[PDB]
């Protein structure tokens, strides 16, 4: 009962957590740092999904996102943009054969990177990221092994 009552109550000034990459000093190529999370349904040819977020940079960049089957998807794609300070995003896109993952590709990018509230969305509305809002971890977000940079979920830097 109690711990139900408190995950009822609305509270904003409460800290919110967000993942975070401490990306550091850019890379020569998208692929030399990349971060993934799979839908937990795989996306359908020709149904179109809408990949939802609110990110923060420490600089005004594009952010990248190729999603991947047995080919990559490069275009069309929610690849989305981010500024200094949270903004929100939706991007909406077609898959056009059958895709299990999302390639964020950070490598040209320096500096810090948190994302929150993580959705994607199917046709009828299903969201198929696992863990979007990082309250607990960020357990379903992977790297290749060989990326040296740490994953972590830390509270939110502008409250
Ligand atoms: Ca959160």
């Given at each position: 009962?109690?711990?139900?009552?408190?995950?009822?109550?609305?509270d904003?000034?409460?800290?919110?957590?967000?993942?975070?990459?401490?990306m550091?000093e850019?890379?020569?190529?998208?692929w030399?740092?990349?971060?993934?999370?799979?839908?937990?349904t795989?996306?359908?040819?020709?149904?179109?999904?809408?990949?939802?977020?609110?990110?923060?940079?420490?600089?005004?960049?594009?952010?990248?996102?190729?999603?991947?089957?047995?080919?990559?998807?490069?275009?069309?794609?929610?690849?989305?943009k981010?500024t200094?300070?949270?903004?929100?995003?939706?991007?909406?896109?077609?898959?056009?054969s059958?895709?299990?993952?999302?390639?964020?590709?950070?490598?040209?990018?320096?500096?810090?990177?948190?994302?929150?509230?993580?959705?994607?969305?199917?046709?009828?509305?299903?969201?198929?990221?696992?863990?979007?809002?990082?309250?607990?971890?960020?357990?379903?977000?992977?790297?290749?092994?060989?990326?040296?940079?740490?994953?972590?979920?830390?509270?939110?830097?502008?409250?």
């Amino acid at each position: 009962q109690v711990a139900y009552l408190n995950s009822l109550i609305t509270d904003p000034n409460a800290t919110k957590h967000v993942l975070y990459i401490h990306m550091g000093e850019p890379k020569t190529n998208n692929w030399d740092r990349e971060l993934y999370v799979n839908p937990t349904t795989e996306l359908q040819s020709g149904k179109t999904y809408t990949l939802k977020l609110r990110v923060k940079t420490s600089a005004a960049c594009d952010v990248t996102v190729w999603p991947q089957g047995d080919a990559t998807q490069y275009w069309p794609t929610p690849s989305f943009k981010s500024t200094t300070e949270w903004t929100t995003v939706a991007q909406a896109f077609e898959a056009k054969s059958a895709l299990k993952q999302l390639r964020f590709e950070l490598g040209t990018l320096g500096g810090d990177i948190w994302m929150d509230d993580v959705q994607l969305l199917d046709p009828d509305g299903n969201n198929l990221i696992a863990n979007g809002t990082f309250e607990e971890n960020a357990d379903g977000w992977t790297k290749p092994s060989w990326h040296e940079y740490e994953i972590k979920t830390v509270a939110d830097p502008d409250q």
